[PDB]
């Protein structure tokens, strides 16, 4: 048995590789003297799917090495498509035909000619048959499958599909015998990542470049989610800094330094700033109780087995920093996965482009264990305007089924809307689908206002005595982003006129 992962090449997926070894490839390592009786035809094809950067292409070449082909030819689907119909199918035929020569020539004792597709999922979209809308590329898949299971079948072959879209694949392509068996790869657990670090480190470990103050057992877990593809780049940076250390002129961790640089597949820390410019200024009880509620129901998911999915929206009047509050609710618990979906990046897109950007984010999130996702300015991506009712029906439909769609068993997430007006949503029946709501009252009172202004510290005791004189009495209704706006607008003034400029503008807010 040659299938042990103490061999260095790959790791972390040991159960999944074990399964394919168990039922897929057992026939090919066995004494043939037995199996020649049973006439068991080997699996011609296999599929393995998962996220991109999780180390599948070193699985494939490594199984070829395990059971030796002449060699793999690896291809990407989009690397072959041609406008001219003949070329694409011809390319595929060339790929298979490399084997057929040996098969017919040397009969049935030939070694495997192995094929790998990097992504089929573009070429193998599921065709459907009617006079219109047959499809653009619907005739390449026919050539592929006619080679796989066709007339004058060949036993000289093995083919590994790789994809990130397992649901778009045709249903006959993966029927038993054409590709019989499917496996899932998922982004590795901490055990797998400490293995991975052992792998990519093993040369440095042998050469003893990095001798001190370095522990993989802790350094694996301090990053809760990364991609095995990304870890080799991380290790490269840790090796690169010792060489960038001698720009000044035996090895150190730089991981704690560079992890902030690294964008993950998972959580990012560099998108906060735009939503949080200034951080969270607690002006009164409502702020802290709101984010206390966020910290309250985050525990709900992580400790609940019967509510994998949960959702809220922060309603309130405009310019109350609901986006920032959602961002802070995300940041407080150090989630594995946080991500924004927003019109800032979905700008200038069609109603079916922003849906397919949003579904990408969510199906990305489904495959992490625990997650928090946030949607800001619902009205914007919903493309609402009051004059006329106008919106994209597609988007809200596709948004709320996602709010009602549970992820696979054992994975959980919460969803956070920032919608600023909910009357539309109550009439348009998204509010029964949201679990519950949060009112974010903007500041209602001057006794809290001057407190907030003290926390910011723009104005002196005299300038603030002015305010304390002018309004105790009014209940001012003001969004704080507007507060920032007009304090900065009055900050440029003749200093003598500064304060009453601010006051006069503030008294134009309405209500």
């Amino acid at each position: 048995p040659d299938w042990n992962f103490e061999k260095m090449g790959i790791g972390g997926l040991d159960k999944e590789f074990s399964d394919i070894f168990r039922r897929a490839f057992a026939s090919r390592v066995f004494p043939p003297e037995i199996v020649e009786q049973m006439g068991c035809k080997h699996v011609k094809g296999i599929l393995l799917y998962g996220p991109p950067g999780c180390g599948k292409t070193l699985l494939a070449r490594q199984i070829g090495k395990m059971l030796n082909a002449r060699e793999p030819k690896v291809v990407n689907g989009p690397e072959i498509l041609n406008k001219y119909v003949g070329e694409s199918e011809a390319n595929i035929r060339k790929l298979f035909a490399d084997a057929e020569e040996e098969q017919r020539r040397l009969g049935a004792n030939s070694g495997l000619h192995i094929i790998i597709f990097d992504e089929i999922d573009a070429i193998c979209k599921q065709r459907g048959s009617m006079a219109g809308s047959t499809g653009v590329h619907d005739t390449v898949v026919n050539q592929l499958l006619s080679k796989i299971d066709g007339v004058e079948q060949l036993n000289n072959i093995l083919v590994i599909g790789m994809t990130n879209r397992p649901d778009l694949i045709d249903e006959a392509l993966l029927r038993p015998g054409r590709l019989e068996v499917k496996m899932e790869i998922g982004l590795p657990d901490e055990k797998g990542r400490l293995q991975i670090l052992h792998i990519h480190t093993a040369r440095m470990r042998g050469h003893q470049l990095l001798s001190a103050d370095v522990d993989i057992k802790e350094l694996a877990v301090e990053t809760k989610n990364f991609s095995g593809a990304e870890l080799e780049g991380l290790v490269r940076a840790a090796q690169s800094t010792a060489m960038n250390r001698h720009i000044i002129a035996r090895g150190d961790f730089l991981a704690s330094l560079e992890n902030d640089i690294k964008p993950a597949f998972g959580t990012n820390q560099e998108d906060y700033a735009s939503y949080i410019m200034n951080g969270i200024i607690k002006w009164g009880d409502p702020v802290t109780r709101v984010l206390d509620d966020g910290e309250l129901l985050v525990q709900q998911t992580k400790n609940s087995d019967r509510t994998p999915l949960v959702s809220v929206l922060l309603e309130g009047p405009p310019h109350s920093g609901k986006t920032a509050l959602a961002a802070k609710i995300a940041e407080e618990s150090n989630f594995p996965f946080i991500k924004i979906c927003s019109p800032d990046k979905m700008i200038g897109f069609s109603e079916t482009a922003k849906c397919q950007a949003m579904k990408k984010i969510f199906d990305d999130a489904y495959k992490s264990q625990l997650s928090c996702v946030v949607v800001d300015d619902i009205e914007r991506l919903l493309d609402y305007v009051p004059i006329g009712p106008r919106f994209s029906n597609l988007v809200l439909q596709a948004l709320l089924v996602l709010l009602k769609k549970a992820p696979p068993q054992g994975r959980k997430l919460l969803i956070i809307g920032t919608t600023s007006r909910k009357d539309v949503l109550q009439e348009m029946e998204m509010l029964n689908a949201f679990s519950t709501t949060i009112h974010v009252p903007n500041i209602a009172t001057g006794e809290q206002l001057l407190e907030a202004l003290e926390l910011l510290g723009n104005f002196k005791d005299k300038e603030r005595t002015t305010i304390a004189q002018q309004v105790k009495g009014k209940k001012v209704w003001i969004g704080i982003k507007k507060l920032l706006m007009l304090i900065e607008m009055s900050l440029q003034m003749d200093p003598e006129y500064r304060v009453r400029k601010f006051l006069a503008l503030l008294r134009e807010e309405g209500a």
Partner: peptide
Amino acid sequence: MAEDADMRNELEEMQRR
């Protein structure tokens, strides 16, 4: 796509004199 281009091409004669 929905693309059909069917095309032709021309010969460059070899010198055998």
